[PDB]
mmCIF file of all heavy atoms in Angstrom:
data_model
loop_
_atom_site.group_PDB
_atom_site.id
_atom_site.type_symbol
_atom_site.label_atom_id
_atom_site.label_comp_id
_atom_site.label_asym_id
_atom_site.label_seq_id
_atom_site.Cartn_x
_atom_site.Cartn_y
_atom_site.Cartn_z
ATOM 1 N N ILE C 992 58.282 89.138 44.085
ATOM 2 C CA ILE C 992 57.770 89.788 42.918
ATOM 3 C C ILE C 992 58.934 90.084 41.969
ATOM 4 O O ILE C 992 58.872 89.722 40.725
ATOM 5 C CB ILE C 992 57.083 91.106 43.298
ATOM 6 C CG1 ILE C 992 55.795 90.726 43.854
ATOM 7 C CG2 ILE C 992 56.936 92.033 42.035
ATOM 8 C CD1 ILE C 992 55.249 91.864 44.749
ATOM 9 N N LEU C 993 60.142 90.502 42.388
ATOM 10 C CA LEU C 993 61.145 90.825 41.590
ATOM 11 C C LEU C 993 61.947 89.553 41.169
ATOM 12 O O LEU C 993 62.462 89.492 39.966
ATOM 13 C CB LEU C 993 62.058 91.861 42.195
ATOM 14 C CG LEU C 993 61.313 93.230 42.184
ATOM 15 C CD1 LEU C 993 62.383 94.202 42.667
ATOM 16 C CD2 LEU C 993 60.818 93.748 40.782
ATOM 17 N N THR C 994 62.089 88.540 41.994
ATOM 18 C CA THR C 994 62.749 87.282 41.527
ATOM 19 C C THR C 994 61.907 86.426 40.541
ATOM 20 O O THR C 994 62.463 85.510 39.942
ATOM 21 C CB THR C 994 63.248 86.449 42.723
ATOM 22 O OG1 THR C 994 62.207 86.049 43.530
ATOM 23 C CG2 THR C 994 64.379 87.263 43.497
ATOM 24 N N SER C 995 60.590 86.786 40.366
ATOM 25 C CA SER C 995 59.881 86.157 39.302
ATOM 26 C C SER C 995 59.637 87.078 38.078
ATOM 27 O O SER C 995 58.758 86.807 37.220
ATOM 28 C CB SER C 995 58.529 85.674 39.911
ATOM 29 O OG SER C 995 57.738 86.668 40.271
ATOM 30 N N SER C 996 60.325 88.206 37.963
ATOM 31 C CA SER C 996 60.299 89.143 36.924
ATOM 32 C C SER C 996 61.160 88.874 35.759
ATOM 33 O O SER C 996 62.420 88.627 35.916
ATOM 34 C CB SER C 996 60.777 90.513 37.504
ATOM 35 O OG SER C 996 61.025 91.390 36.403
ATOM 36 N N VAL C 997 60.601 88.811 34.576
ATOM 37 C CA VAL C 997 61.334 88.663 33.332
ATOM 38 C C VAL C 997 62.345 89.813 33.137
ATOM 39 O O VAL C 997 63.463 89.390 32.739
ATOM 40 C CB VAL C 997 60.354 88.564 32.051
ATOM 41 C CG1 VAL C 997 61.101 88.700 30.765
ATOM 42 C CG2 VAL C 997 59.652 87.224 32.128
ATOM 43 N N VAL C 998 62.109 91.000 33.464
ATOM 44 C CA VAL C 998 63.001 92.091 33.324
ATOM 45 C C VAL C 998 64.253 91.809 34.171
ATOM 46 O O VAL C 998 65.319 91.953 33.838
ATOM 47 C CB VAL C 998 62.375 93.440 33.636
ATOM 48 C CG1 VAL C 998 63.389 94.537 33.609
ATOM 49 C CG2 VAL C 998 61.247 93.781 32.717
ATOM 50 N N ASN C 999 63.962 91.387 35.401
ATOM 51 C CA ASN C 999 65.076 91.087 36.355
ATOM 52 C C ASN C 999 65.853 90.016 35.862
ATOM 53 O O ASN C 999 67.118 90.125 35.855
ATOM 54 C CB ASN C 999 64.560 90.830 37.705
ATOM 55 C CG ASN C 999 65.615 90.899 38.878
ATOM 56 O OD1 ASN C 999 66.639 91.495 38.703
ATOM 57 N ND2 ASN C 999 65.177 90.438 40.017
ATOM 58 N N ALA C 1000 65.336 88.885 35.384
ATOM 59 C CA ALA C 1000 66.127 87.675 34.816
ATOM 60 C C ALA C 1000 67.038 88.052 33.636
ATOM 61 O O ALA C 1000 68.133 87.542 33.507
ATOM 62 C CB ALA C 1000 65.173 86.622 34.418
ATOM 63 N N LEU C 1001 66.543 88.992 32.908
ATOM 64 C CA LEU C 1001 67.234 89.456 31.637
ATOM 65 C C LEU C 1001 68.046 90.756 31.802
ATOM 66 O O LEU C 1001 68.429 91.339 30.766
ATOM 67 C CB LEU C 1001 66.170 89.699 30.528
ATOM 68 C CG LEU C 1001 65.418 88.340 30.238
ATOM 69 C CD1 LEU C 1001 64.518 88.690 29.100
ATOM 70 C CD2 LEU C 1001 66.293 87.142 30.000
ATOM 71 N N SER C 1002 68.261 91.123 33.113
ATOM 72 C CA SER C 1002 69.130 92.347 33.419
ATOM 73 C C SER C 1002 70.412 91.851 34.047
ATOM 74 O O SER C 1002 70.455 90.946 34.995
ATOM 75 C CB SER C 1002 68.454 93.232 34.365
ATOM 76 O OG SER C 1002 67.410 93.843 33.699
ATOM 77 N N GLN C 1003 71.532 92.413 33.618
ATOM 78 C CA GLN C 1003 72.817 92.009 34.326
ATOM 79 C C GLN C 1003 72.812 92.531 35.785
ATOM 80 O O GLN C 1003 73.480 91.920 36.609
ATOM 81 C CB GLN C 1003 74.065 92.504 33.596
ATOM 82 C CG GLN C 1003 74.087 93.999 33.397
ATOM 83 C CD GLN C 1003 75.559 94.508 33.186
ATOM 84 O OE1 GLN C 1003 76.053 94.446 32.073
ATOM 85 N NE2 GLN C 1003 76.127 95.304 34.092
ATOM 86 N N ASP C 1004 72.140 93.596 35.941
ATOM 87 C CA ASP C 1004 71.912 94.217 37.338
ATOM 88 C C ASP C 1004 70.575 94.922 37.367
ATOM 89 O O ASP C 1004 70.155 95.493 36.422
ATOM 90 C CB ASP C 1004 72.966 95.336 37.598
ATOM 91 C CG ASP C 1004 74.421 94.792 37.724
ATOM 92 O OD1 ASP C 1004 74.699 94.289 38.792
ATOM 93 O OD2 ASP C 1004 75.155 94.887 36.801
ATOM 94 N N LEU C 1005 69.961 94.838 38.591
ATOM 95 C CA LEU C 1005 68.695 95.597 38.793
ATOM 96 C C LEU C 1005 68.654 96.003 40.212
ATOM 97 O O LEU C 1005 69.137 95.161 41.163
ATOM 98 C CB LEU C 1005 67.541 94.678 38.425
ATOM 99 C CG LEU C 1005 66.139 95.352 38.552
ATOM 100 C CD1 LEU C 1005 65.187 94.665 37.533
ATOM 101 C CD2 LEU C 1005 65.572 95.227 39.968
ATOM 102 N N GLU C 1006 68.240 97.198 40.481
ATOM 103 C CA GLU C 1006 68.062 97.665 41.890
ATOM 104 C C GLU C 1006 66.525 98.124 42.084
ATOM 105 O O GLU C 1006 65.990 98.712 41.190
ATOM 106 C CB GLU C 1006 68.892 98.887 42.056
ATOM 107 C CG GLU C 1006 70.372 98.661 41.937
ATOM 108 C CD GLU C 1006 71.223 99.878 41.938
ATOM 109 O OE1 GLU C 1006 70.748 101.027 41.883
ATOM 110 O OE2 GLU C 1006 72.532 99.594 41.927
ATOM 111 N N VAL C 1007 66.038 97.916 43.329
ATOM 112 C CA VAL C 1007 64.795 98.431 43.634
ATOM 113 C C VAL C 1007 65.002 99.320 44.939
ATOM 114 O O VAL C 1007 65.729 99.009 45.836
ATOM 115 C CB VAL C 1007 63.695 97.395 43.892
ATOM 116 C CG1 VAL C 1007 64.000 96.455 45.079
ATOM 117 C CG2 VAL C 1007 62.251 98.003 44.083
ATOM 118 N N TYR C 1008 64.188 100.406 44.929
ATOM 119 C CA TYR C 1008 64.069 101.200 46.187
ATOM 120 C C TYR C 1008 62.643 101.350 46.422
ATOM 121 O O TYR C 1008 61.891 101.778 45.507
ATOM 122 C CB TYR C 1008 64.636 102.539 46.084
ATOM 123 C CG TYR C 1008 66.143 102.583 45.952
ATOM 124 C CD1 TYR C 1008 66.790 102.469 44.652
ATOM 125 C CD2 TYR C 1008 66.936 102.761 47.075
ATOM 126 C CE1 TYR C 1008 68.212 102.496 44.614
ATOM 127 C CE2 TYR C 1008 68.244 102.732 47.016
ATOM 128 C CZ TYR C 1008 68.901 102.654 45.757
ATOM 129 O OH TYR C 1008 70.267 102.679 45.783
ATOM 130 N N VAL C 1009 62.060 100.946 47.529
ATOM 131 C CA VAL C 1009 60.651 101.061 47.833
ATOM 132 C C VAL C 1009 60.560 102.215 48.944
ATOM 133 O O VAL C 1009 61.267 102.114 49.992
ATOM 134 C CB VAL C 1009 60.082 99.828 48.379
ATOM 135 C CG1 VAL C 1009 58.660 100.006 48.813
ATOM 136 C CG2 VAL C 1009 60.078 98.755 47.331
ATOM 137 N N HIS C 1010 59.579 103.155 48.752
ATOM 138 C CA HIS C 1010 59.276 104.123 49.750
ATOM 139 C C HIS C 1010 57.966 103.684 50.344
ATOM 140 O O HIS C 1010 56.871 103.774 49.586
ATOM 141 C CB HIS C 1010 59.173 105.520 49.214
ATOM 142 C CG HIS C 1010 60.475 106.090 48.791
ATOM 143 N ND1 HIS C 1010 60.925 107.298 49.278
ATOM 144 C CD2 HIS C 1010 61.359 105.588 47.975
ATOM 145 C CE1 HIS C 1010 62.175 107.600 48.688
ATOM 146 N NE2 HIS C 1010 62.390 106.524 47.913
ATOM 147 N N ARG C 1011 57.829 103.232 51.649
ATOM 148 C CA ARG C 1011 56.659 102.769 52.164
ATOM 149 C C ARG C 1011 56.854 102.740 53.723
ATOM 150 O O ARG C 1011 57.956 102.518 54.143
ATOM 151 C CB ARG C 1011 56.462 101.349 51.615
ATOM 152 C CG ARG C 1011 55.121 100.740 51.953
ATOM 153 C CD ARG C 1011 54.981 99.441 51.150
ATOM 154 N NE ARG C 1011 53.930 98.690 51.631
ATOM 155 C CZ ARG C 1011 52.757 98.482 51.039
ATOM 156 N NH1 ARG C 1011 52.423 98.865 49.849
ATOM 157 N NH2 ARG C 1011 51.852 97.837 51.792
ATOM 158 N N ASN C 1012 55.745 102.922 54.436
ATOM 159 C CA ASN C 1012 55.836 102.823 55.943
ATOM 160 C C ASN C 1012 56.897 103.867 56.454
ATOM 161 O O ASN C 1012 57.590 103.548 57.397
ATOM 162 C CB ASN C 1012 56.218 101.409 56.476
ATOM 163 C CG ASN C 1012 55.495 100.320 55.846
ATOM 164 O OD1 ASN C 1012 54.346 100.284 55.715
ATOM 165 N ND2 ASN C 1012 56.251 99.228 55.458
ATOM 166 N N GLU C 1013 57.071 104.995 55.745
ATOM 167 C CA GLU C 1013 58.019 106.146 56.122
ATOM 168 C C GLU C 1013 59.366 105.677 56.092
ATOM 169 O O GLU C 1013 60.269 106.209 56.648
ATOM 170 C CB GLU C 1013 57.566 106.764 57.452
ATOM 171 C CG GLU C 1013 56.182 107.371 57.361
ATOM 172 C CD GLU C 1013 55.033 106.446 57.434
ATOM 173 O OE1 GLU C 1013 55.092 105.510 58.343
ATOM 174 O OE2 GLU C 1013 54.077 106.627 56.637
ATOM 175 N N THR C 1014 59.722 104.631 55.331
ATOM 176 C CA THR C 1014 60.926 103.889 55.305
ATOM 177 C C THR C 1014 61.391 103.738 53.789
ATOM 178 O O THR C 1014 60.504 103.493 52.876
ATOM 179 C CB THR C 1014 60.916 102.581 56.016
ATOM 180 O OG1 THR C 1014 60.552 102.746 57.405
ATOM 181 C CG2 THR C 1014 62.249 101.856 56.114
ATOM 182 N N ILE C 1015 62.646 103.710 53.556
ATOM 183 C CA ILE C 1015 63.175 103.429 52.197
ATOM 184 C C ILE C 1015 63.822 102.033 52.331
ATOM 185 O O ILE C 1015 64.756 101.802 53.183
ATOM 186 C CB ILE C 1015 64.227 104.464 51.741
ATOM 187 C CG1 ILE C 1015 63.579 105.827 51.633
ATOM 188 C CG2 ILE C 1015 64.780 104.048 50.309
ATOM 189 C CD1 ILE C 1015 64.558 107.063 51.373
ATOM 190 N N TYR C 1016 63.406 101.110 51.482
ATOM 191 C CA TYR C 1016 63.936 99.754 51.428
ATOM 192 C C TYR C 1016 64.698 99.546 50.129
ATOM 193 O O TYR C 1016 64.266 100.068 49.102
ATOM 194 C CB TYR C 1016 62.861 98.736 51.611
ATOM 195 C CG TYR C 1016 61.961 98.887 52.738
ATOM 196 C CD1 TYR C 1016 60.866 99.670 52.712
ATOM 197 C CD2 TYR C 1016 62.089 98.137 53.877
ATOM 198 C CE1 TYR C 1016 59.970 99.859 53.773
ATOM 199 C CE2 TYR C 1016 61.251 98.255 54.950
ATOM 200 C CZ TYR C 1016 60.156 99.123 54.877
ATOM 201 O OH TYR C 1016 59.220 99.302 55.978
#
């Protein structure tokens, strides 16, 4: 999802944190 994102391609840096399954990824 994020490697096919226009925002990601046009950002020098991008970070994601997902909160799911009682876990932070």
Side-chain angles (χ1 to χ4, degrees):
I992 288 155
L993 288 185
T994 63
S995 70
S996 167
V997 167
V998 174
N999 198 20
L1001 299 183
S1002 293
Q1003 62 158 78
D1004 291 279
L1005 182 150
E1006 294 170 358
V1007 61
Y1008 293 85
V1009 173
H1010 289 234
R1011 191 171 164 105
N1012 314 308
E1013 297 80 44
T1014 304
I1015 301 173
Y1016 305 89

